[PDB]
Write an enzyme that holds these catalytic residues in place. Structure first.
Site, PDB file in Angstrom:
ATOM      1  N   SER A 101     -65.934  13.133 -35.062  1.00 22.30           N
ATOM      2  CA  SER A 101     -66.821  14.136 -35.634  1.00 22.30           C
ATOM      3  C   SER A 101     -67.792  14.671 -34.587  1.00 22.30           C
ATOM      4  CB  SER A 101     -67.602  13.561 -36.818  1.00 22.30           C
ATOM      5  OG  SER A 101     -68.141  14.613 -37.592  1.00 22.30           O
ATOM      6  N   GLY A 102     -68.150  15.937 -34.736  1.00 17.77           N
ATOM      7  CA  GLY A 102     -69.156  16.522 -33.883  1.00 17.77           C
ATOM      8  C   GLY A 102     -69.771  17.728 -34.544  1.00 17.77           C
TER       9      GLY A 102
ATOM     10  N   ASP B  51     -59.199  21.456 -19.859  1.00 14.46           N
ATOM     11  CA  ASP B  51     -59.989  20.220 -19.946  1.00 14.46           C
ATOM     12  C   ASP B  51     -59.116  18.976 -19.801  1.00 14.46           C
ATOM     13  OD1 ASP B  51     -62.395  18.803 -20.030  1.00 14.46           O
ATOM     14  OD2 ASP B  51     -62.875  19.324 -22.108  1.00 14.46           O
TER      15      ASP B  51
END
Ligand SMILES: Cc1ccc2c(Nc3cccc(Cl)c3F)nccc2c1NC(=O)c1csc2c(N)ncnc12
Ligand SMILES: Cc1ccc2c(Nc3cccc(Cl)c3F)nccc2c1NC(=O)c1csc2c(N)ncnc12
Ligand SMILES: [Cl-]
Ligand SMILES: [Cl-]
Ligand SMILES: [Cl-]
Ligand SMILES: [Cl-]
Ligand SMILES: [Cl-]
Ligand SMILES: [Cl-]
Ligand SMILES: [Cl-]
Ligand SMILES: [Cl-]
Ligand SMILES: [Cl-]
Ligand SMILES: [Cl-]
Ligand SMILES: [Cl-]
Lengths: 272, 272
Positions: B17-18, B128
């Protein structure tokens, strides 16, 4: 767009071959399998059947379905998939006679049911499910495919296929062995074939081992007077699994469960 | 068509989660991961970024890329992938400190290069790559993904992303750390990040461990006066691998090799 331009695939060792094509190991950003027609100018029939197979594979993104990666049309019509190390479930049960613990047998049934549940949810009828078509990638992960299609066996023409009965007879539902139709194949005949796979897992052997001629099996399974003997099942086989097998093997196709319920039952049995 | 109709996915335990979303374990014809936005009515920006990610994933069919399985728009915008048991390469090298034999380290580099070669052949820039984004499925098979995107980190807005530097600074090429542009990201900056992954594999540790502040790394890597110290590499590291690492880590992006040649070199080194 999944067409792979000509010259990118490096075609390697021949792996399998028949009257309808050849499969090779190859290289394309890693290891691949490459299945191509043995011919030069395909008939419209051959081209269209090629397109049918690609259109089925293009619909599948599931860890238990062999991964389609691309196709090509120059110089030969070719289908490209991931390359799997390992061997078929048939080889494990009836050639190497691998000793799978009951937990792993149930895990294999559960992954097979996941893949079949997915295929049927995508409106894909497999038509030739059997333990030789269940590949154990690294002898751990199920990859469902049709490993005879367009090499030893031809592609489908309606419900016809050359070498249809070849190595498949034991998995054919009664209504498929009779073919009192132009299509006996259904989700329910896939379910019957899965029941026979369950029989192989729980007995370790092929059904009807005692019968001495193919035509006998043809007649008696089509007649309804021949069925797998569930009493030959191993003693550590769970009661639930025998019930499930008997359900999948019912003679009238409309009495067999569907894969959502098959899968939920196996998941429950795996939880223990 | 890969839209999964509402009500089919059973959303389970929260996994990550963020500020930009949440990822759950779920069930849909087997185990899946499900990443959704934390919001109710997405901004056009949020919707479009969702579509960008789905359009990248829809282009990928490769055993070393995490398998995209579908998406949904009711009730929340969600992306569905296969579920992988195991842990990231970062966890293995720098948390559990798993003791990989040199052969397995080279195998991990080779599978990573297969996936990256495939992505670049599909015109996909990863942006990334780092060991936390290299998942070891059953601690054996590499699955490249972006495990921070649209949870901890936002989706891409041009070459901007919220929490861009978070846990990524050590893998950023000089031209990415400076951003003397509106897009520093290229196939060649992916190649630099892969060189840093090679450094982690061959030293077992993170570069610049001795430097005490992030801004120091920012300044000195952007300036060209800071580079991984290849002499800290393990003694059983093959000479070829040190050469390859040095090539991938070159300061001017146009001097770095491309992944077709990177992969062929690692394949050669694996053959031994
Ligand atoms: C190239 C290619 C194309 C389509 C396939 C195919 N098509 C298909 C048709 C109908 C339904 C479904 Cl589910 C299907 F997947 N099925 C199975 C295998 C298929 C296949 N590969 C092999 O033939 C193969 C033999 S050995 C081996 C190995 N070691 N690793 C990986 N591949 C192989
Ligand atoms: C649901 C979902 C959707 C897109 C993903 C994604 N998108 C992506 C974006 C850019 C480039 C590339 Cl290559 C990508 F794959 N990347 C990585 C993971 C992605 C993902 N899953 C997880 O977040 C995840 C966390 S734990 C875990 C696990 N144990 N098993 C499987 N999934 C997970
Ligand atoms: Cl390769
Ligand atoms: Cl697709
Ligand atoms: Cl197991
Ligand atoms: Cl054919
Ligand atoms: Cl077909
Ligand atoms: Cl015909
Ligand atoms: Cl399930
Ligand atoms: Cl290994
Ligand atoms: Cl976002
Ligand atoms: Cl994105
Ligand atoms: Cl912004």
């Amino acid at each position: 767009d999944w067409e792979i331009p000509d010259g990118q695939i490096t075609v390697g060792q021949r792996i399998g071959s028949g009257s309808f094509g050849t499969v090779y190991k190859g290289k394309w950003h890693g290891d691949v399998a490459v299945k191509m027609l043995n011919v030069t100018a395909p008939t419209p029939q051959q081209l269209q059947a090629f397109k049918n197979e690609v259109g089925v594979l293009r619909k599948t993104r599931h860890v238990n379905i062999l991964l389609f990666m691309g196709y090509s049309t120059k110089p030969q019509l070719a289908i490209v998939t991931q390359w799997c190390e390992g061997s078929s479930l048939y080889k494990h049960l009836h050639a190497s006679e691998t000793k799978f613990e009951m937990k792993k047998l149930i895990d294999i049934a559960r992954q097979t049911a996941r893949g079949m549940d997915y295929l049927h949810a995508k409106s894909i009828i497999h038509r030739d499910l059997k333990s030789n078509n269940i590949f154990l990638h690294e002898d751990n992960t199920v990859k469902i495919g049709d490993f005879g299609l367009a090499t030893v066996k031809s592609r489908w023409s309606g419900s016809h296929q050359f070498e249809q009965l070849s190595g498949s007879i034991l998995w054919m539902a009664p209504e498929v062995i009779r073919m009192q139709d132009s299509n006996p194949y259904s989700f329910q005949s896939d379910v019957y074939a899965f029941g026979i796979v369950l029989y192989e897992l729980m007995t370790g052997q092929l059904p009807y081992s005692n019968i001495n001629n193919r035509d006998q099996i043809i007649e008696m399974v089509g007649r309804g007077s021949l069925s797998p003997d569930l009493s030959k099942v191993r003693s550590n086989c769970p009661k639930r699994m025998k019930r499930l097998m008997a359900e999948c093997l019912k003679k009238k196709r409309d009495e067999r469960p569907s894969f959502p319920r098959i899968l939920a039952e196996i998941e429950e049995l795996a939880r223990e």
